[PDB]
Design a protein around this ligand. Structure first.
Ligand SMILES: CCCCCCCCCCCCCCCCCC(=O)OC[C@H](COP(=O)([O-])OC[C@H](O)COP(=O)([O-])OC[C@H](COC(=O)CCCCCCCCCCCCCCCCC)OC(=O)CCCCCCCCCCCCCCCCC)OC(=O)CCCCCCCCCCCCCCCCC
Ligand SMILES: CCCCCCCCCCCCCCCCCC(=O)OC[C@H](COP(=O)([O-])OCC[N+](C)(C)C)OC(=O)CCCCCCCCCCCCCCCCC
Ligand SMILES: CCCCCCCCCCCCCCCCCC(=O)OC[C@H](COP(=O)(O)OCCN)OC(=O)CCCCCCCCCCCCCCCCC
Ligand SMILES: CCCCCCCCCCCCCCCCCC(=O)OC[C@H](COP(=O)(O)OCCN)OC(=O)CCCCCCCCCCCCCCCCC
Ligand SMILES: CCCCCCCCCCCCCCCCCC(=O)OC[C@H](COP(=O)(O)OCCN)OC(=O)CCCCCCCCCCCCCCCCC
Ligand SMILES: *C(=O)CCCCCCCCCCCCC
Lengths: 99, 128, 87, 79, 155, 65, 122, 13, 177, 459
């Protein structure tokens, strides 16, 4: 067995009222009635102004203080020429060639 | 046959395996009808206030106020100092205090003995 | 995603599933065809019809509601009530 | 608007594994009433899906052809 | 809310038990209080200690998030048996069998990591060799001291 | 135009998604075969593993007494 | 990996213990045994900032390879020859370590045969 | 079309 | 057991709930549709064998050991529908189900944004507050002494009267707001 | 300090001569001007404390408590003007007079150069607080809560009076500046043991210590919102201030007298956080959270390392702002649902999204999210207690786990889940409420930028 006739009548009436409610939930074609209110600007305003700001900051307030920007010294190989000195690094010993 | 399900405190017995669910006797029918009647009368008493257009507030639950007043405000008037409560108040009240006292006292006596002998390595410790 | 259901589309899909069930001939079937009185089906058949509705529309009908849907119009009305169609 | 559903007569289970299921049920006198509901899954475009070695070797033919072309191009490029 | 709707002391007479069972909106035969061992429960009902997860999720509850109704006597540990917290629902495997299998698996894995620590695998090679007395100055050795010469040979 | 949903049957495909799927499967197999051609050692082996049992005693320094 | 079975399921008296080996002197069995020559200078691999795990006896090929890798930027597929030279010399060092293992294992065999011959004689 | 009204709490304040 | 209308579960309802749980857990065990269809017909045969059983004690015993059968042979992670309780999408959109009375607290500058909606809402609120006293006196004249026995609600009997306690059923939120 | 005492007294004719619709606006405006003026106390030096007169001085410990105190008065006036809207005009002016007078007592409590003046002001702060709780408290329990609040403090503090007059007769002075140079070692004797107890137990009650905290989840709950704000934000910190002054004199006897109280507070921060896990009252949950946070300040004062004092004064300021904001959020829901039960109003983020953002940020500061000064004080106390004993890291970490648990449990319970259906008087958030929340939270977040002004005399 299924519903009683009272339950089917109540579901029918609630169904009609529910569908009227949901149909009233639609918008009008005039609603929402609102009150009355450059191609590469991103790469300017989000990079080129921050690189200016951060480079000014790092150049004249951070690198002016000691050990703030400390850098690992550049790697020196046999054969290199030092720019600060002009000193040429002597190369390695000639290899006991294996193959 | 099949391994029987053994219910635990944190894993209860299912409704489909409970032997008291399949009762057809009239005392269980009257108990379940009376429970449905209580739940239905409380349901009606709720949803008359809940569906009221004039009501704008809190449908106050006396069961909730009754629960919070049982949880806090009625505990001490329903307290009797007896064997069970005194042993649970001594075990759970000063037990851990004595335990952590002897733990931290042992650890600090050991640390102070190693420090005043120069045995604890304290080379770079200058923040304290 | 998720195109809206209409009562026309729900009724067509429900009758489409019930016409693909071998214990119901399609030429007798209508929306008011009671499964036990008219179509002469078992309660096991009604449970299987509800499970085919669940596998068709993708949501579970609970058993307190599944024991009561005894004609296809009741099923379409229940799927309307739980999907809120004709907004 | 109106989504027109296809024919319900076109989903017959002959030629599907539902046929083998109904044969192995009718061997003991059982009959399946929901096979035509399941029959769309095994027919039409969803029929004859690939295996797993057919799944891994998708694009193997064009990839191996491009490999032949690139090896030939570097063998003709060194000269 | 008023005085005779608040919880009271432990019921001793059956009419006090019936008045308390009427107070907590439940049957007299289903009303059991916590046992009067003085812990401080009063006449509050001992509900059957289930989580709210076991409640019927398809029933139209008055509090659908909590699976609880209005006027229903709450469990003493209702804040504990919420669905955000401790679940008491029936498990497909027994509790003791779960505990035995999990403890045995964890104990067996720890025992086998200890055995494999006691019997480690390696490769049929010697130690890795390093120049300059096993890299004495590189490993922070002081240059005022002179290490023992660690000499490696060809093979 | 967009895709219209179908009922109980294989959906409408775009030519673009099919040629992209085929192109990236072909790119996968071309890259696997190309790197297996040029390297061939990261899978099978870089250097021949020597046999210590076939080593003589003179190169290892084992004096017979 | 059969040597694990020979050390565990057999005896360890003939199998070498990897944490302490060589247990035998490096001249015991070698008349005038030559040393391993270090090609890369200590200051050269100090200035090259090599990892202390990487400052082994074949650091010179690693220095040449890192110099090629720095100098051939951005052509990151340009210096496979220096890399294979460094890998080949690491392979030779690994063969030398295998020779140390087999030398210690055969001298443990020599000590075992020696003490068994001594137990048979005296 | 068939735009539905979205009941949401008062976002003015 | 626990139902809003009935006070118990009948034997027939327990058998049907067992049959549905068994088919769902079997479908979880028997993933492919042809194989599930085969074993589901076998399970239908196992339920149709003891179907015409008129001994209620024998049927109760068969139901009980069939529940033990189902408990021993259930899938540990059965398939749950997503909006079904336990499912991966269950009660997901409850954070978007704002009740209807929150529109009453809007500022008039955002009620002016939807003039026809609130103008059409005021007649719903009017309809509810004229239906209310009639549906209260409808409930008090039909409910017996001692309160209602079941949680069933009676429908409306006259024409022009709305069903009693209809507002929070009709004006409930949608499932996808 | 007279340039702050005199305008606070001039707030009394400002609140009694104001027009009847102007008595909130005028007191709010001029107390905001006093709070602006409070920043002149940041004239601190690395060697010397800012020593004004024979009566008043301010080091870097009293200065953040002063700025927090003078900042708390306009926020208490904003919080307490909605539920006292229907009050009589004379009783409204009496409430504002009790708030102004409590501020007047506190700002010369923290600056007291001499310790018996500190005692007189310190116990003078009971009387407006007692009047506020027992007069403008809401429920029945406010009278009993006023009894507990009065008679724990006086039971602790009347031995403190005898102790301070004994120091006055022995050292010759209770000037703290003189006692910085005339301090003598306090050796082991039973006389000095009870000397230590008489000097410390009043402040242990005021913090509160675990086991003596039973005045607090009734006084903080049964007060009105301005009472709850001042009790959580300043009146617990009077105890830590008095401890950091008075433990100058209690050495070396503190090095073994501290052990029972360190055990009580290290176990009370576990037990009261566990209590917070099972509270049904939201306001009591915030009360036991305050006990849990002040237990760490007690441990940090009793181990008396510099990192511990820095973390303790940072945690006192941070907890003042955070607990005041948590009570104000609790009041913002209590003024809608008229119940302090936490499980009643649920799902409130669906209704009040920006107020739920304020709930989120106050729950994040409660769980000590870095880089807030909550985490700074928490973290420095954990560093110093680890250096004290390495096994205290277990209790500190377990406390942090339970603290995160009850903070986010409070957030999830009140703000998340399905909303309560039968509650329909959930108004939108007023501008007063959101302004109150922001005036708590925005200084608490800006103090993460420059946190050195809340790290005490030995930053
Ligand atoms: C001295 C000059 C100082 C200038 C800089 C100021 C520095 C920060 C100050 C404080 C910033 C937070 C205040 C605004 C948020 C609160 C209100 C709110 O919800 O607004 C949403 C609203 C936009 O949202 P909506 O959708 O419209 O409505 C809200 C939604 O309904 C629902 O809302 P919702 O949930 O969608 O959105 C809330 C969202 C929710 O998200 C979260 O809660 C996640 C946050 C935590 C995780 C991520 C951060 C972790 C920590 C890392 C960052 C700090 C260190 C970074 C440095 C590097 C590492 C060391 O939170 C946020 O978006 C907050 C962003 C900023 C986070 C700061 C940390 C807050 C976390 C808690 C404390 C952590 C430790 C302290 C850190 C202090 C740092 C200074 O914002 C506004 O309209 C802004 C109003 C104006 C704000 C002014 C703030 C400064 C005022 C100071 C005045 C005096 C000084 C003058 C300077 C003025 C500068 C403008
Ligand atoms: C919160 C509630 C509880 C509060 C507890 C407060 C602390 C507990 C201990 C307080 C002891 C009393 C004050 C001591 C002041 C010390 C000053 C001094 O000079 O001491 C050295 C003096 C030494 O004597 P003297 O100073 O004359 O001699 C000079 C010093 N010698 C001895 C070296 C020559 O100590 C005393 O005279 C006695 C001190 C102990 C007094 C014991 C009585 C009180 C017992 C505890 C009561 C606690 C409250 C109970 C009620 C609670 C509410 C119901
Ligand atoms: C011990 C013991 O059994 O005490 C029980 C006694 C009451 O005895 P009863 O059981 O009534 O006979 O009870 C008493 O004698 C009163 C209480 C005894 C002491 C209790 C000690 C622990 C108190 C809590 C400490 C928390 C910190
Ligand atoms: C090198 C060392 C390596 C060591 C590795 C192992 C160390 C840790 C050992 C295990 C300890 C932690 C795990 C136990 C607690 C787990 C709590 C948890 O996850 O709760 C989740 C639970 C709901 O989870 P679930 O069942 O999945 O939900 C599905 C939908 N209902 O949610 C709930 O029920 C809500 C719970 C809220 C209250 C929580 C109370 C418990 C708090 C536990 C604190 C533990 C503190 C440990 C301190 C250690 C100090 C050293
Ligand atoms: C639960 C409520 C909330 C919490 C409230 C506060 C609780 C803690 C308050 C008291 C703290 C404990 C007392 C002080 C402990 C510090 C060290 C000490 O004095 O230990 C007690 C003493 C140990 O012996 P010892 O110290 O060597 O004796 C020589 C003393 N010149 O022991 C002895 O000599 C034996 C016992 C002597 C008498 C002890 C009791 C009276 C003194 C404390 C009051
Ligand atoms: C001896 O066998 C040395 C190798 C390392 C130990 C054994 C590793 C066994 C697992 C890897 C090889 C698996 C072959 C199927």
């Amino acid at each position: 067995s299924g519903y009683t006739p009272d339950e089917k009548l109540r579901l029918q009436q609630l169904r009609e009222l529910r569908r009227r409610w949901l149909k009233d939930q639609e918008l009008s074609p005039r609603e929402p009635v609102l009150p009355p209110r450059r191609h590469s600007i991103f790469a300017f305003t989000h990079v080129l102004i921050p690189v200016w700001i951060i480079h000014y900051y790092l150049k004249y307030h951070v690198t002016t203080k000691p050990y703030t920007i400390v850098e690992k010294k550049p790697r020196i190989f046999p054969g290199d020429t030092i720019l600060e000195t002009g000193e040429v690094i002597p190369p390695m010993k000639e290899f006991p060639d294996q193959h | 046959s099949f391994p029987k399900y053994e219910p635990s405190r944190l894993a209860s017995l299912p409704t489909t395996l409970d032997p008291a669910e399949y009762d057809i006797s009239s005392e269980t029918r009257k108990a379940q009808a009376e429970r449905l009647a209580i739940r239905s009368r409380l349901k009606r008493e709720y949803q008359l206030q809940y569906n009221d257009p004039s009501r704008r507030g809190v449908v106050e639950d006396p069961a909730l106020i009754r629960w919070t007043c049982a949880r806090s405000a009625n505990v001490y008037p329903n307290f009797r100092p007896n064997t069970k409560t005194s042993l649970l108040g001594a075990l759970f009240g000063i037990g851990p205090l004595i335990f952590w006292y002897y733990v931290f006292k042992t650890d600090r006596d050991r640390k102070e003995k190693l420090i005043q002998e120069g045995k604890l390595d304290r080379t770079f410790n200058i923040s304290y | 995603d998720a195109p809206p259901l209409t009562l026309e589309g729900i009724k067509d899909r429900v009758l489409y599933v019930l016409k693909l069930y071998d214990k119901i001939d399609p030429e007798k079937l209508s929306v008011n065809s009671h499964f036990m009185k008219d179509l002469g089906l078992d309660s096991l058949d009604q449970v299987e019809i509800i499970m085919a509705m669940e596998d068709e529309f993708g949501f579970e009908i609970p058993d307190i509601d599944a024991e009561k849907l005894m004609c296809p119009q009741e099923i379409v009305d229940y799927i309307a009530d739980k999907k809120d169609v004709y907004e | 608007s109106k989504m027109e559903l296809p024919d319900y007569k076109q989903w017959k289970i002959e030629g599907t594994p539902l046929e083998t299921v109904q044969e192995k049920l009718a061997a003991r006198g059982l009959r399946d009433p929901w096979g035509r509901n399941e029959a769309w899954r095994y027919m039409g475009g969803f029929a004859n899906n690939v295996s797993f070695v057919g799944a891994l070797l998708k694009g193997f033919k064009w990839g191996f052809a491009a490999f032949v072309v690139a090896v030939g191009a570097e063998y003709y490029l060194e000269s | 809310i008023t005085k005779d709707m608040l919880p009271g002391p432990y019921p001793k007479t059956p009419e006090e038990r019936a008045a308390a069972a009427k107070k907590y909106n439940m049957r007299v035969e289903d009303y059991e209080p916590y046992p009067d061992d003085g812990m401080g429960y009063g006449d509050y009902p001992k509900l059957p200690d289930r989580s709210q997860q076991e409640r019927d999720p398809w029933y139209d509850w008055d509090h659908p998030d909590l699976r609880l109704n209005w006027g229903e006597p709450m469990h003493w540990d209702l804040d504990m048996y919420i669905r955000n917290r401790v679940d008491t629902s029936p498990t497909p495997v027994n509790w003791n069998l779960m505990c035995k299998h999990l403890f045995g698996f964890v104990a067996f894995m720890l025992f086998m990591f200890w055995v494999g620590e006691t019997y480690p695998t390696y490769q049929p090679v010697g130690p890795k060799q390093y120049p300059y007395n096993n890299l004495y100055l590189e490993r922070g050795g002081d240059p005022n001291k002179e290490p023992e010469p660690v000499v490696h040979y060809e093979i | 135009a967009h895709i219209e949903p179908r009922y109980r049957q294989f959906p409408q495909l775009t030519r673009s998604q099919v040629i992209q799927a085929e192109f990236f499967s072909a790119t996968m197999w071309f890259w696997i075969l190309w790197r297996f051609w040029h390297d061939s050692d990261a899978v099978l082996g870089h250097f021949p593993y020597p046999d210590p049992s076939q080593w003589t005693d003179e190169e290892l320094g084992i004096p017979p007494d | 990996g059969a040597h694990l079975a020979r050390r565990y399921l057999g005896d360890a008296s003939v199998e070498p213990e990897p944490l302490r080996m060589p247990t035998f002197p490096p001249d015991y069995g070698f008349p005038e045994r030559k040393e391993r020559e270090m090609v890369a200078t200590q200051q050269e691999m100090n200035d090259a900032q090599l990892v202390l795990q990487q400052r082994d006896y074949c650091a010179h090929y690693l220095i040449r390879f890192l110099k090629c890798k720095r100098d051939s930027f951005p052509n990151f597929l340009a210096c496979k020859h220096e890399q294979h030279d460094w890998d080949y010399c690491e392979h030779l060092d690994y063969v030398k370590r295998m020779k140390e293992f087999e030398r210690e294992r055969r001298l443990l065999q020599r000590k075992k045969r020696r003490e068994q011959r001594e137990a048979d004689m005296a | 079309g068939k735009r539905l009204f979205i009941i949401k709490p008062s976002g003015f304040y | 057991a626990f139902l809003p209308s009935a006070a118990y579960l009948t034997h027939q309802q327990k058998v049907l709930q067992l049959y549905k749980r068994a088919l769902r857990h079997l479908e979880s065990r028997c993933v492919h549709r042809d194989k599930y269809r085969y074993f589901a017909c076998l399970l239908r045969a196992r339920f149709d064998e003891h179907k015409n059983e008129k001994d209620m004690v024998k049927a109760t015993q068969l139901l009980r050991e069939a529940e033990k059968e189902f408990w021993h042979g259930q899938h540990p992670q059965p398939y749950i529908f997503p909006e079904s309780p336990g499912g991966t999408s269950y009660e997901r959109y409850e954070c978007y189900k704002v009740p209807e009375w929150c529109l009453d607290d809007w500022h008039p500058s955002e009620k002016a944004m939807y003039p026809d909606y609130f103008a059409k809402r005021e007649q719903w609120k009017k309809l509810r507050r004229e239906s209310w006293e009639r549906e209260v006196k409808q409930l008090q004249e039909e409910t017996p002494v001692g309160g209602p026995r079941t949680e069933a609600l009676p429908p409306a009997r006259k024409q022009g009267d709305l069903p009693p306690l209809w507002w929070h059923i009709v004006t409930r939120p949608r499932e996808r707001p | 300090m007279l340039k702050y005492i005199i305008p606070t007294m001039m707030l009394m004719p400002l609140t009694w001569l104001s027009k009847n619709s102007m008595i909130w606006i005028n007191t709010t405006l001029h107390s905001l001007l006093i709070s602006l003026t409070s920043l002149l106390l940041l004239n601190q030096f690395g060697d010397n404390s800012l020593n004004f007169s024979l009566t008043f001085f301010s080091d870097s410990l009293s200065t953040p408590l002063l700025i927090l105190t003078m900042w708390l008065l306009p926020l208490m006036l904003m919080a307490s003007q909605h539920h006292l809207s229907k009050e009589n005009l004379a009783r409204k002016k009496l409430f504002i007079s009790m708030l102004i007078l409590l501020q007047l007592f506190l700002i010369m409590t923290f600056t007291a150069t001499e310790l018996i003046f500190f005692y007189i002001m310190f116990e003078a702060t009971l009387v407006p607080t007692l009047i506020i709780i027992t007069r403008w408290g809401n429920q029945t329990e406010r009278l009993n809560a006023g009894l507990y609040f009065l008679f724990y403090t006086l039971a602790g503090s009347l031995p403190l009076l005898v102790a301070l007059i004994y120091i006055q007769n022995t050292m010759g002075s209770l000037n703290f500046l003189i006692l910085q140079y005339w301090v003598q070692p306090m050796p082991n004797s039973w006389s000095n043991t009870f000397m230590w107890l008489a000097c410390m137990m009043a402040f242990m009650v005021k913090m509160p210590l675990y086991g003596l905290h039973l005045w607090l989840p009734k006084a903080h709950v049964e007060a009105p919102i301005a009472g709850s704000m001042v009790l959580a934000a300043i009146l617990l910190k009077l105890g830590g201030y008095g401890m950091m002054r008075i433990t100058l004199l209690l050495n070396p006897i503190t090095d073994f007298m501290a052990y029972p109280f360190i055990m009580l507070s290290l176990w009370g921060m576990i037990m009261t956080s566990s209590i917070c896990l099972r509270q049904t009252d939201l306001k009591s949950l915030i009360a036991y959270s305050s006990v849990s946070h002040m237990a760490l300040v007690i441990v940090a004062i009793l181990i008396q390392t510099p990192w511990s004092y820095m973390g303790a004064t940072a945690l006192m300021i941070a907890h003042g702002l955070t607990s005041s904001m948590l009570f104000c959020l609790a009041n913002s829901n209590y003024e809608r649902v008229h119940s302090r039960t936490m499980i009643l109003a649920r799902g409130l983020q669906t209704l009040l999204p920006l107020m739920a953002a304020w709930w989120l940020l106050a729950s994040l500061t409660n769980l000590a999210l870095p880089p807030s000064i909550n985490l700074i004080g928490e973290l420095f106390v954990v560093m110093s207690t680890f250096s004290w004993s390495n096994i205290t890291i277990i209790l500190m970490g377990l406390n942090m786990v339970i603290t995160a648990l009850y903070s986010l449990y409070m957030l999830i319970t009140t703000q998340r889940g399905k909303h309560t259906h039968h509650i329909n008087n959930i108004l939108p958030s007023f501008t007063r409420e959101n302004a109150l929340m922001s005036l708590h939270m925005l200084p608490l977040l800006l103090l993460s930028l420059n946190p050195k002004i809340i790290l005490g005399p030995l930053y």
